[PDB]
């Protein structure tokens, strides 16, 4: 149920997204989400 994004995502956008996911899901879900985001970012780069 995450917001669909169609614009560029800079560092501040990622920081705000993580700060909102910590409050909405918790640290347990956010850790795995951040790990998967890291993997996808490394693959794309």
């Amino acid at each position: 149920n995450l917001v669909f994004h169609n614009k560029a995502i800079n560092g501040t956008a990622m920081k705000r997204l993580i700060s909102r996911l910590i409050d909405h899901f918790g640290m347990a879900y956010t850790s795995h989400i951040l790990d998967q985001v890291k993997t996808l970012g490394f693959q794309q780069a």
Binding site: G26, S31, Q36
Partner: protein, 88 residues
Amino acid sequence: RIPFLEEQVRKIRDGGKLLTMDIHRLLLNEDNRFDFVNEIAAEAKQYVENNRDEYGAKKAILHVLSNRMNDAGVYRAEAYMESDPFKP
């Protein structure tokens, strides 16, 4: 129902990310996170004082956490030990 999702589930079950979820779930019913640590330490000491070698599968703390998670309706392995059957 995503079809291609079994790989990361197996990775979670194997790498040991289940304990990170179980600790956070158990910290949802306790007010202080220090009394919970003290209670777990006391229970582990009482369980290791009875049987020295038979503290569980490998350790006692993991055994205590598995016993606490199995009494709430969540099936967990004995002391979170699952060997790899594909090791030659």
